[PDB]
Amino acid sequence: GRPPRLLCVDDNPANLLLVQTLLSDLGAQVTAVDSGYAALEVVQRERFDLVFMDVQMPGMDGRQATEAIRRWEAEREVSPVPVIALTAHALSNEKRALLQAGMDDYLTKPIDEQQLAQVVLKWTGLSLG
Protein backbone atom coordinates (compact mmCIF):
# COMPACT_ATOMS: atom_id res chain seq x y z
CA GLY A 1 0.00 0.00 0.00
CA ARG A 2 1.07 3.66 -0.42
CA PRO A 3 2.72 5.43 2.55
CA PRO A 4 0.26 6.93 5.03
CA ARG A 5 0.38 10.72 5.26
CA LEU A 6 0.28 11.57 8.95
CA LEU A 7 0.12 14.77 10.96
CA CYS A 8 1.59 14.79 14.49
CA VAL A 9 0.64 17.66 16.87
CA ASP A 10 2.51 18.11 20.19
CA ASP A 11 3.67 21.20 22.13
CA ASN A 12 6.66 19.20 23.60
CA PRO A 13 9.42 19.33 20.94
CA ALA A 14 11.23 16.19 22.24
CA ASN A 15 7.99 14.11 22.34
CA LEU A 16 6.96 15.47 18.91
CA LEU A 17 10.33 14.44 17.44
CA LEU A 18 10.09 10.97 19.12
CA VAL A 19 6.63 10.16 17.64
CA GLN A 20 7.53 11.74 14.23
CA THR A 21 10.76 9.67 14.04
CA LEU A 22 8.97 6.39 15.01
CA LEU A 23 6.40 7.03 12.23
CA SER A 24 8.95 8.17 9.58
CA ASP A 25 11.19 5.14 10.33
CA LEU A 26 8.10 2.89 9.74
CA GLY A 27 7.63 4.54 6.27
CA ALA A 28 4.95 7.20 6.97
CA GLN A 29 5.12 10.64 5.35
CA VAL A 30 4.95 12.78 8.48
CA THR A 31 4.25 16.45 9.12
CA ALA A 32 4.94 17.57 12.71
CA VAL A 33 3.49 20.78 14.22
CA ASP A 34 3.76 22.36 17.62
CA SER A 35 0.23 23.58 18.46
CA GLY A 36 -3.49 23.21 17.91
CA TYR A 37 -3.42 26.50 16.01
CA ALA A 38 -0.81 25.00 13.61
CA ALA A 39 -2.92 21.82 13.37
CA LEU A 40 -5.96 23.77 12.10
CA GLU A 41 -3.90 25.74 9.56
CA VAL A 42 -2.03 22.70 8.19
CA VAL A 43 -5.26 20.61 7.99
CA GLN A 44 -6.83 23.42 5.90
CA ARG A 45 -3.82 23.26 3.57
CA GLU A 46 -3.06 19.49 3.38
CA ARG A 47 -4.98 16.23 3.03
CA PHE A 48 -3.75 13.75 5.68
CA ASP A 49 -4.78 10.17 6.20
CA LEU A 50 -4.77 10.66 9.98
CA VAL A 51 -3.90 13.21 12.69
CA PHE A 52 -2.27 12.39 16.04
CA MET A 53 -3.37 15.20 18.40
CA ASP A 54 -1.77 15.87 21.82
CA VAL A 55 -4.63 16.64 24.24
CA GLN A 56 -2.85 19.07 26.64
CA MET A 57 -1.55 22.18 24.84
CA PRO A 58 -1.83 25.79 26.00
CA GLY A 59 -4.24 28.27 24.35
CA MET A 60 -5.89 25.68 22.08
CA ASP A 61 -5.99 22.15 23.52
CA GLY A 62 -6.42 18.99 21.43
CA ARG A 63 -10.24 18.97 21.91
CA GLN A 64 -10.48 22.65 20.81
CA ALA A 65 -8.18 21.98 17.81
CA THR A 66 -10.35 19.01 16.79
CA GLU A 67 -13.50 21.17 17.12
CA ALA A 68 -11.78 23.82 14.93
CA ILE A 69 -10.99 21.15 12.32
CA ARG A 70 -14.52 19.71 12.37
CA ARG A 71 -16.09 23.20 12.04
CA TRP A 72 -13.84 24.00 9.04
CA GLU A 73 -14.47 20.58 7.41
CA ALA A 74 -18.24 21.16 7.68
CA GLU A 75 -18.23 24.81 6.49
CA ARG A 76 -15.62 24.25 3.75
CA GLU A 77 -17.14 20.83 2.76
CA VAL A 78 -14.19 18.45 3.06
CA SER A 79 -14.10 14.70 3.92
CA PRO A 80 -13.30 14.29 7.65
CA VAL A 81 -9.80 13.30 8.72
CA PRO A 82 -9.44 10.73 11.52
CA VAL A 83 -8.13 12.38 14.70
CA ILE A 84 -6.46 10.21 17.36
CA ALA A 85 -5.88 11.76 20.81
CA LEU A 86 -2.49 11.24 22.49
CA THR A 87 -3.24 11.47 26.22
CA ALA A 88 -1.36 10.79 29.51
CA HIS A 89 -3.85 8.63 31.49
CA ALA A 90 -7.54 9.32 30.75
CA LEU A 91 -10.59 8.18 32.73
CA SER A 92 -13.87 7.21 30.98
CA ASN A 93 -15.34 10.75 31.32
CA GLU A 94 -12.17 12.26 29.71
CA LYS A 95 -12.32 9.75 26.82
CA ARG A 96 -16.06 10.55 26.30
CA ALA A 97 -15.10 14.28 26.14
CA LEU A 98 -12.42 13.54 23.47
CA LEU A 99 -15.08 11.75 21.34
CA GLN A 100 -17.62 14.58 22.01
CA ALA A 101 -15.02 17.08 20.62
CA GLY A 102 -14.97 15.03 17.35
CA MET A 103 -11.88 12.86 18.04
CA ASP A 104 -12.17 9.29 16.71
CA ASP A 105 -9.91 7.30 19.07
CA TYR A 106 -7.16 7.70 21.65
CA LEU A 107 -3.79 6.25 22.67
CA THR A 108 -2.41 6.55 26.24
CA LYS A 109 1.22 7.86 26.54
CA PRO A 110 3.95 6.86 26.46
CA ILE A 111 3.31 6.06 22.77
CA ASP A 112 4.83 2.85 21.28
CA GLU A 113 5.40 1.68 17.69
CA GLN A 114 2.85 -1.19 17.95
CA GLN A 115 -0.01 1.05 19.26
CA LEU A 116 0.77 3.62 16.49
CA ALA A 117 0.92 0.95 13.71
CA GLN A 118 -2.33 -0.68 14.95
CA VAL A 119 -4.32 2.60 15.11
CA VAL A 120 -3.04 3.74 11.65
CA LEU A 121 -4.13 0.40 10.11
CA LYS A 122 -7.53 0.50 11.90
CA TRP A 123 -8.43 4.03 10.75
CA THR A 124 -6.72 4.27 7.31
CA GLY A 125 -6.24 0.69 5.95
CA LEU A 126 -2.52 1.49 5.48
CA SER A 127 0.21 -0.65 7.11
CA LEU A 128 3.41 0.70 8.70
CA GLY A 129 6.72 -1.23 9.13
Added chain:
Amino acid sequence: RPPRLLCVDDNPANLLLVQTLLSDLGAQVTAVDSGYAALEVVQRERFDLVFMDVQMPGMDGRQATEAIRRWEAEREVSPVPVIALTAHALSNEKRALLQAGMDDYLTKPIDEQQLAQVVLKWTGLSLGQSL
Protein backbone atom coordinates in the same frame (compact mmCIF):
# COMPACT_ATOMS: atom_id res chain seq x y z
CA ARG B 1 16.43 27.38 22.27
CA PRO B 2 17.87 25.37 19.31
CA PRO B 3 17.93 26.83 15.81
CA ARG B 4 14.57 26.46 14.08
CA LEU B 5 14.86 25.47 10.42
CA LEU B 6 12.40 24.97 7.54
CA CYS B 7 13.06 22.40 4.76
CA VAL B 8 10.91 22.62 1.52
CA ASP B 9 10.93 19.91 -1.19
CA ASP B 10 8.30 18.28 -3.41
CA ASN B 11 10.22 14.93 -3.38
CA PRO B 12 9.34 13.10 -0.13
CA ALA B 13 12.63 11.09 -0.02
CA ASN B 14 14.82 14.22 -0.57
CA LEU B 15 12.73 16.18 1.99
CA LEU B 16 13.17 13.43 4.62
CA LEU B 17 16.96 13.28 3.93
CA VAL B 18 17.49 17.03 4.55
CA GLN B 19 15.08 17.04 7.54
CA THR B 20 16.90 14.03 9.08
CA LEU B 21 20.35 15.70 8.70
CA LEU B 22 19.12 19.01 10.21
CA SER B 23 17.36 17.22 13.16
CA ASP B 24 20.62 15.20 13.65
CA LEU B 25 22.51 18.56 13.97
CA GLY B 26 20.09 19.42 16.87
CA ALA B 27 17.81 21.87 14.98
CA GLN B 28 14.04 22.05 15.54
CA VAL B 29 12.92 21.24 11.96
CA THR B 30 9.72 21.70 9.93
CA ALA B 31 9.50 19.93 6.55
CA VAL B 32 6.91 21.00 3.94
CA ASP B 33 6.14 19.77 0.45
CA SER B 34 5.57 22.92 -1.69
CA GLY B 35 6.30 26.60 -2.14
CA TYR B 36 2.68 27.34 -1.20
CA ALA B 37 3.23 25.51 2.09
CA ALA B 38 6.56 27.36 2.61
CA LEU B 39 4.80 30.76 2.41
CA GLU B 40 2.04 29.72 4.81
CA VAL B 41 4.36 28.15 7.42
CA VAL B 42 6.80 31.14 7.28
CA GLN B 43 3.81 33.39 8.14
CA ARG B 44 2.87 31.09 11.04
CA GLU B 45 6.26 30.15 12.60
CA ARG B 46 9.57 31.95 13.18
CA PHE B 47 12.46 30.12 11.49
CA ASP B 48 16.11 31.10 11.67
CA LEU B 49 16.67 29.88 8.10
CA VAL B 50 14.79 28.17 5.22
CA PHE B 51 16.18 25.55 2.82
CA MET B 52 14.12 25.80 -0.42
CA ASP B 53 13.96 23.31 -3.31
CA VAL B 54 14.19 25.26 -6.60
CA GLN B 55 12.03 23.03 -8.87
CA MET B 56 8.41 22.55 -7.70
CA PRO B 57 5.17 22.71 -9.71
CA GLY B 58 2.84 25.76 -9.54
CA MET B 59 5.08 27.79 -7.22
CA ASP B 60 8.80 27.11 -7.67
CA GLY B 61 11.41 27.97 -5.03
CA ARG B 62 12.12 31.40 -6.65
CA GLN B 63 8.38 32.27 -6.62
CA ALA B 64 8.03 31.01 -3.02
CA THR B 65 10.98 33.19 -1.94
CA GLU B 66 9.40 36.21 -3.66
CA ALA B 67 6.10 35.42 -1.87
CA ILE B 68 7.93 35.29 1.49
CA ARG B 69 9.81 38.55 0.79
CA ARG B 70 6.56 40.35 -0.21
CA TRP B 71 4.83 39.13 3.01
CA GLU B 72 7.85 40.13 5.18
CA ALA B 73 7.83 43.65 3.67
CA GLU B 74 4.05 44.24 3.98
CA ARG B 75 3.61 42.47 7.37
CA GLU B 76 6.78 44.22 8.68
CA VAL B 77 8.61 41.12 9.95
CA SER B 78 12.38 40.49 10.31
CA PRO B 79 13.47 38.66 7.13
CA VAL B 80 14.48 35.00 7.12
CA PRO B 81 17.50 33.83 5.09
CA VAL B 82 16.49 31.46 2.26
CA ILE B 83 19.01 28.95 0.85
CA ALA B 84 18.27 27.20 -2.45
CA LEU B 85 18.75 23.44 -2.77
CA THR B 86 19.63 22.69 -6.42
CA ALA B 87 20.64 19.45 -8.29
CA HIS B 88 23.38 21.04 -10.51
CA ALA B 89 22.47 24.64 -11.48
CA LEU B 90 23.88 26.58 -14.50
CA SER B 91 25.40 30.07 -13.82
CA ASN B 92 22.17 31.72 -15.18
CA GLU B 93 20.10 29.59 -12.71
CA LYS B 94 22.43 30.59 -9.75
CA ARG B 95 22.04 34.33 -10.69
CA ALA B 96 18.21 33.82 -11.02
CA LEU B 97 18.00 32.42 -7.44
CA LEU B 98 19.63 35.61 -6.03
CA GLN B 99 17.43 37.87 -8.23
CA ALA B 100 14.35 36.11 -6.62
CA GLY B 101 15.50 37.09 -3.07
CA MET B 102 17.28 33.83 -2.17
CA ASP B 103 20.47 34.50 -0.17
CA ASP B 104 22.62 31.53 -1.27
CA TYR B 105 22.48 27.98 -2.59
CA LEU B 106 23.79 24.46 -2.03
CA THR B 107 24.17 21.74 -4.72
CA LYS B 108 22.34 18.33 -4.17
CA PRO B 109 25.28 16.29 -2.70
CA ILE B 110 24.29 17.78 0.73
CA ASP B 111 26.14 16.75 3.92
CA GLU B 112 25.71 17.70 7.60
CA GLN B 113 28.99 19.71 7.70
CA GLN B 114 27.87 21.90 4.73
CA LEU B 115 24.36 22.43 6.22
CA ALA B 116 25.92 23.50 9.56
CA GLN B 117 28.33 25.91 7.76
CA VAL B 118 25.40 27.51 5.87
CA VAL B 119 23.43 27.97 9.13
CA LEU B 120 26.49 29.51 10.87
CA LYS B 121 27.16 31.87 7.95
CA TRP B 122 23.58 33.11 7.51
CA THR B 123 22.28 33.02 11.16
CA GLY B 124 25.43 33.06 13.42
CA LEU B 125 23.98 29.95 15.17
CA SER B 126 26.05 26.82 15.89
CA LEU B 127 24.76 23.26 15.34
CA GLY B 128 26.14 19.71 15.78
CA GLN B 129 28.99 19.24 18.35
CA SER B 130 28.86 23.10 18.83
CA LEU B 131 25.10 23.02 19.76
